[PDB]
Design a protein around this ligand. Sequence first.
Ligand code: COA
Ligand code: COA
Ligand code: ROV
Ligand code: ROV
Ligand code: CLR
Ligand code: CLR
Ligand code: CLR
Ligand code: CLR
Lengths: 409, 409, 409, 409
Amino acid sequence: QGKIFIARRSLLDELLEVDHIRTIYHMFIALLILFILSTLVVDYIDEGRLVLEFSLLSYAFGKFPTVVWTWWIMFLSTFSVPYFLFQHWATGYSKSSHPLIRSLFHGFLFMIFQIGVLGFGPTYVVLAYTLPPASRFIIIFEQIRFVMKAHSFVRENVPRVLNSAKEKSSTVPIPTVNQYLYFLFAPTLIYRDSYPRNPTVRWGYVAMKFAQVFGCFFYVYYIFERLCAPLFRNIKQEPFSARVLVLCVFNSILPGVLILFLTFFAFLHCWLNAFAEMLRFGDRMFYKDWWNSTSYSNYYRTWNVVVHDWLYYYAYKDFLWFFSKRFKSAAMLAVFAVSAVVHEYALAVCLSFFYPVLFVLFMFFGMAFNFIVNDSRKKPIWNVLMWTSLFLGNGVLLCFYSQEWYARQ
Amino acid sequence: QGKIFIARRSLLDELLEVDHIRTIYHMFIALLILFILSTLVVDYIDEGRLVLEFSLLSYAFGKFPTVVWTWWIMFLSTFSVPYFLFQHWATGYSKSSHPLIRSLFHGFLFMIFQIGVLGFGPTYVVLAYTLPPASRFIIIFEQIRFVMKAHSFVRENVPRVLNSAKEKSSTVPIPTVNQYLYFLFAPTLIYRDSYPRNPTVRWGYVAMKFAQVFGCFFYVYYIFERLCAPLFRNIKQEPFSARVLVLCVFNSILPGVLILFLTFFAFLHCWLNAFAEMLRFGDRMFYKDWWNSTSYSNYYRTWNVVVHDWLYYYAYKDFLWFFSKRFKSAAMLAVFAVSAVVHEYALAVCLSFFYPVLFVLFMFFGMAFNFIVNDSRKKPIWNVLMWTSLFLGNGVLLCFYSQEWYARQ
Amino acid sequence: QGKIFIARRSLLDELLEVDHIRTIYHMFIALLILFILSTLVVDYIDEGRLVLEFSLLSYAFGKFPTVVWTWWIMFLSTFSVPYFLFQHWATGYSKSSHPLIRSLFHGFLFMIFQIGVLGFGPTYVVLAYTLPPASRFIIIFEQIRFVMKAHSFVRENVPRVLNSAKEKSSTVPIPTVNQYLYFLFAPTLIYRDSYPRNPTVRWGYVAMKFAQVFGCFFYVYYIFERLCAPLFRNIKQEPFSARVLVLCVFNSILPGVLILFLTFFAFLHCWLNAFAEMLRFGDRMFYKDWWNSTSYSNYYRTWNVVVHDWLYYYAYKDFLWFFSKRFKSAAMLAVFAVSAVVHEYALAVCLSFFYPVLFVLFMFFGMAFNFIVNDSRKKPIWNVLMWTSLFLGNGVLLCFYSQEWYARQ
Amino acid sequence: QGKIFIARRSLLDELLEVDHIRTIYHMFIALLILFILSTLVVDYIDEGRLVLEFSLLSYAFGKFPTVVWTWWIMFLSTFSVPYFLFQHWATGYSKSSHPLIRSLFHGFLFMIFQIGVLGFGPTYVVLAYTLPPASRFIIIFEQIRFVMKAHSFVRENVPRVLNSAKEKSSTVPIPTVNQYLYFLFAPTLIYRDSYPRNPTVRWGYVAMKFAQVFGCFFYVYYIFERLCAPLFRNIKQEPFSARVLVLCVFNSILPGVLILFLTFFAFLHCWLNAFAEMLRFGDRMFYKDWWNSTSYSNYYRTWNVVVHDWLYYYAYKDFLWFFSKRFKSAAMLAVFAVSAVVHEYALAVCLSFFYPVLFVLFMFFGMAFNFIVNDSRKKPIWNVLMWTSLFLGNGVLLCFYSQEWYARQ
Ligand SMILES: CC(C)(COP(=O)(O)OP(=O)(O)OC[C@H]1O[C@@H](n2cnc3c(N)ncnc32)[C@H](O)[C@@H]1OP(=O)(O)O)[C@@H](O)C(=O)NCCC(=O)NCCS
Ligand SMILES: CC(C)(COP(=O)(O)OP(=O)(O)OC[C@H]1O[C@@H](n2cnc3c(N)ncnc32)[C@H](O)[C@@H]1OP(=O)(O)O)[C@@H](O)C(=O)NCCC(=O)NCCS
Ligand SMILES: CC(C)c1cccc(C(C)C)c1NC(=O)NCC1(c2ccc(N(C)C)cc2)CCCC1
Ligand SMILES: CC(C)c1cccc(C(C)C)c1NC(=O)NCC1(c2ccc(N(C)C)cc2)CCCC1
Ligand SMILES: CC(C)CCC[C@@H](C)[C@H]1CC[C@H]2[C@@H]3CC=C4C[C@@H](O)CC[C@]4(C)[C@H]3CC[C@]12C
Ligand SMILES: CC(C)CCC[C@@H](C)[C@H]1CC[C@H]2[C@@H]3CC=C4C[C@@H](O)CC[C@]4(C)[C@H]3CC[C@]12C
Ligand SMILES: CC(C)CCC[C@@H](C)[C@H]1CC[C@H]2[C@@H]3CC=C4C[C@@H](O)CC[C@]4(C)[C@H]3CC[C@]12C
Ligand SMILES: CC(C)CCC[C@@H](C)[C@H]1CC[C@H]2[C@@H]3CC=C4C[C@@H](O)CC[C@]4(C)[C@H]3CC[C@]12C
């Protein structure tokens, strides 16, 4: 039982040298160049000399030093406190000084840490110090990382000591500082001990990926500056829903499709592969072929495997363990709820306004796209119906939120 | 020396079942559905119940009886006259009734046919009897077809009779009229006798291809409303060239790439393979792998093979035969001159206005791109600069021609 | 039992080179020239320089785009639906998924196709969308063709599958779609597989036949002006039935015999042999020697063989199979009823007026002539009474229908 | 030299049992019946009871007894006088009582007989006794017969005695009364002695032919009564040549074609075969296949052979003998002149009015159709051009003459 790690290459890495997929890479590079050329020409003819600095990224990433030290103190807390609270179980169940009291005491001491440090601290600085929207996503992303890393650490290592406590006069297994610190930078949220590793670090591989991530970040910026600038920055007259909403949703698809592809490739594939090569890591199978998946049969699992496995093993299966067996119902509702609640919250903090049609779109449809679709469907038309729904869902998302953001200015 | 036919499949047809490119097929199907849904919703809320007749295709495909009018007279003339004039060499050089004068007499009669009946006839019809754009294109496209088919027939069969005439008292080779007629519907412009043929015909294949061509034609129509209509039909105020032109070119790039991909797949693969399957034809190498091609060194010989072969074998090589040896300049400029004038002729007749920037764009840059890039460079950066040049070239093409067409009213 | 095809030539084609019947060909050619010369001289002295457009054919062959409109939808439907419904018996009786109900279900679907798409469809088109006479006749003629072709396809191939179904675990015979399509253009309404075929095609033959059919169509047009126009177009005064009717019938006999001979030669021989040569078809016994035939005993089976065979094999013999044995009365009246109603239907739709004297003339006399004359009489006096009956019958037909058509305005 | 007689059957007699030409016989019988039925019905509804006697034939054949005795006295004169004048040469050149005087004396006695009896006598009775037009043709026809029979008798038998006169003490050959009287009823105008004869008279053959001649005569009457009655008996108003003349010529073709066929079959073939069988006669090759002849190459010779041979041997060849050799000019003009002069005269006597466009049509065109056509032409198109010219020539003839006849009443 549990996830088992096998030394594999990433799917898209081996699939980017077929000599037909490398074309699409070059097409997107060519479109990056043509975006840059267009923006530089337009900005040159509008003003005097060409724009030196971008000016959006200065506002978007505003008070950066306060993001650096709040990340540092969050990193120091999640490194020190969970490890020290678990190292307090060095005695643990060996002497057994009245069990049932100390177990739930240290359990409550873990919970007050989880809420007190990561619940308030990250939210307090972003809300109180009036940080800008793009810069706030970094703190919230890293918050959701470290709360997962801490709970994963506690949930996996407790079974070791709790099983080993039955054996009398035996050496208790406790994780060391080195391998836990290694896990806290690793690109997977499952085990603590002896990950499958590669022989040597290339260092040219990590350089090319970090260059692609940089190129992707600029692409995402230029997407919002040309695809989402002209029609959201400008509009303010005859505030009616007669036809303009359908066209605003329609014209926001083509930006949304590229944003979805860039946010995948930049972060999920390219950024994690770079850290998986820089720091020795062998699995690299953290996404799968969702491209030809039946709608939401594999798409749920195959999109992010690292965060899916987190939810599958420690939220879904632990819920099923707590209720023993036989539901396939409110357990499925609870894992969809917590996933939607984490998203709506993360988005709500950054723009400081609420209006989550996102939750209704994740709650109503996220159920609909699993219960009335099934996994056994094999017809290719269902891939079309997935890709229709994904296109429209993301287009409606980007439209309504960027409308709402510029509406409050 | 001449082209040698081998029983192959179209590379995309072979490659479309690899399970990653069938995604891209479903991506474009899904975008068609979302384009149809968007247009039907907008039309419903705008006017009445829903769109009954499309309104654009009614104007564009206007006087269609006077196109069938044209095509059938054009088909009967190009079937009857070229073969009958060549079959009149049955006596040929065998009798030798004072040769050299009768040969040039029949050559003159064939030239008078080519210019008077196909060069002047259908172009007089479309200009004299007023026809709308997209309807004229059928007449001029099918005109250029039958001019090539007629020239291909005579030029290949003259060497047979002349070589057979060298050795006197022999059975003069004249192709039977089932052959040539088969060629007149076959999807290649090269040989007469014994093409490679498949053993059976599927007919489910051709039904799927004509279904796709029917879907592509609509896709292309949907392109003109939801993708181009707003920015061309509407704009009529403040006639200045300050920032609007660069924006209009940039906004017209993204429809452009889709038009280029749809006109490629629909005609060159799907429609042409449908005829290549319905009729028994075995070669089906109408286009090579031009996706992963070096920039402009080989794009010309891998984009459209059937037209390239016609040019390379009958215009280029015949010019090199006439000038004997060693130019690679007069021949290069001659074939470019023949192709670019015919393209300008094709696109100048339909809209009845001239503005041949398309000619100078193909002449000036198309030379450079052949000569500065070379076939010796193998680095992938050139492929990026091909896609950059093709995206910009097509975006400038569609923008400027539409700007000019809509400006004449 | 069924018809057995043997490689023959058309009897007239064989007989046209006997050197005395080639005179009669030249007699009718010479009369065409003298009809053209007479009409051109009259038109010159009457109005202006000469007749530019014929004026009758402009009205008669009126809205011809909405006929191609019809024919192509009708051709695609009768090609696709009948074969696909029959091909759906690929599973057939081999699987035996509860037979007797699915067989009648597909039989019902085929009946709904036959009535709704061909019985009601084209007749609705010609009546709803107003069309002139001689243009409607094309739609209803080609309608009746595809109804017979569709019925002939199913009725011949059902015995194959049922006899093959008796012996289980065998390769179910289903005709390939090159066959049937070949049949759908072949000039006979009987078999599917392996017709007798000639070794080569002449193409000078078909050019001569289409030249003759083109000449015959005009001959028939020339008939309506110089032969009928004066006595139908003009007469409008003193509405009495005193002597004018007998004179009008007598004057309409001599055009009648020419119309009967031209409609025979042009369509049944010349046009049908042109298709029988252009396409490879070997039988060509579309009509026997009905010239020297006993009066009405065998005229029916020697006049038009392709329609007679369809009736005799699929209407007459199937009715005798259904009623088992011994009637020669119910079957005779049934086939007469089917033919006379279809003829009246064909001639009632085109002029939109009814007056079915043609039905009672075929019913009352056509019975008598079959029964009183018999196949046993061999005296030449009966042949005289056939030609007397046919001359009078056609003269009364043309007179009364034209009288009625010209009277409705 | 001279015509040589061979025992042959008539061409159309053996050709009327092919089983395809017998059809045309039955078609013309069927049209005879339908003509009779139409006329009897029309005459019944117009008047009281149906017409008992025809009434036209009573006027047409009026004073018949005076035609009988003038024929009798003409027959007695042409039998008695030429034979007695030639029997006066029983001495002839035997005693030779001053030759050169008696030869030209008896030659002048023959000429005064020829002119005095047959020139005046026949013309005198028809002009003086005011006989009707149809009845006059009998006297003129029989006049032209007996003048030919008499000149043929003299011209052929003179060479016998004139050659035999050189031999001394030899029996002179003189024709007997029996064989000359036999010749005077025979259906050929060439020899006097030992015609090729058949074994036995059938008597059923002559009965069938005389029945056909009677049926043909009635057909010719009904042709003039229905085809030439309604439009020539009636018309008298707005006497202008604007368009009516072209239509009157056009509508008179179809009568003219049947008149030409009936006057051939009735008289030439059927009437002569009847007398050729009744009275023993073996040649019967007095017409040939003119149906497929090149225009006026064989038509001149092949139409009537009996009257052609008369002109060829005794007018044309005797003229060529008198001028020795080498003309092919005024001899050809003279034989065309005498032939045209005999026709125009015969037609002029019966209607008593002159107006011969017939002579201009025989003189101008009869030359044109021999000198500029030639005999060596072999293309089938020339048969069409003959049959066009024959149709128009006879149609113009019947129109203009029957117009002129009713114009003078
Ligand atoms: C003329 C045209 C076919 C150019 O390609 P091309 O004529 O085939 O080029 P060539 O075959 O003459 O050049 C041969 C050289 O290319 C190189 N080469 C490399 N690979 C080669 C290969 N597989 N085959 C041939 N040559 C190759 C070699 O150096 C070779 O040298 P060689 O002379 O020893 O053979 C092409 O421009 C044309 O006809 N039409 C396109 C123009 C047009 O329509 N533009 C519209 C606007 S985009
Ligand atoms: C039904 C129709 C084919 C009549 O001909 P038919 O059905 O072939 O006549 P049958 O073959 O049934 O009659 C057979 C009898 O004819 C006789 N007969 C003579 N020669 C014969 C031959 N060569 N073949 C068959 N029968 C022959 C025999 O007595 C034979 O007797 P049998 O029963 O022992 O065979 C014909 O009327 C028809 O279908 N359509 C024409 C009607 C129409 O459309 N009229 C429009 C107005 S004109
Ligand atoms: C795409 C085009 C610029 C091009 C690039 C490189 C090489 C070639 C040929 C000549 C070998 C072409 N030209 C072509 O393929 N013409 C045929 C078609 C075509 C395309 C556009 C036009 N014009 C509107 C000019 C005419 C024909 C393709 C789609 C339909 C037929
Ligand atoms: C000539 C006709 C009355 C006739 C006599 C005897 C036997 C038959 C067939 C049914 C075997 C027919 N019918 C026919 O041949 N129909 C086909 C055509 C036809 C003729 C007339 C009409 N009408 C205008 C009723 C329809 C079709 C012939 C010429 C064009 C097609
Ligand atoms: C069904 C309708 C919408 C027509 C869609 C036509 C589709 C099938 C065509 C249009 C353009 C085509 C693409 C052209 C470019 C490439 C790049 C190459 O490296 C992989 C194949 C791929 C991705 C092609 C696959 C098929 C394709 C996507
Ligand atoms: C700044 C630039 C370099 C970033 C571009 C990111 C590129 C490499 C990413 C973005 C989306 C990706 C694509 C996502 C969808 C598919 C469909 C699948 O069937 C084949 C791979 C393919 C075509 C992927 C290949 C790589 C891809 C095109
Ligand atoms: C009162 C009735 C019986 C008289 C009818 C006379 C008939 C028998 C005559 C009149 C004209 C004749 C025709 C004249 C023309 C030709 C053309 C030839 O290539 C075949 C014979 C044919 C077809 C003849 C056959 C017999 C014919 C039809
Ligand atoms: C070229 C144009 C004017 C079309 C003419 C069609 C001709 C060739 C057709 C029409 C009617 C036909 C005729 C129909 C009747 C018969 C009677 C038969 O016993 C001999 C053949 C014959 C005489 C046919 C020969 C060919 C024919 C005359």
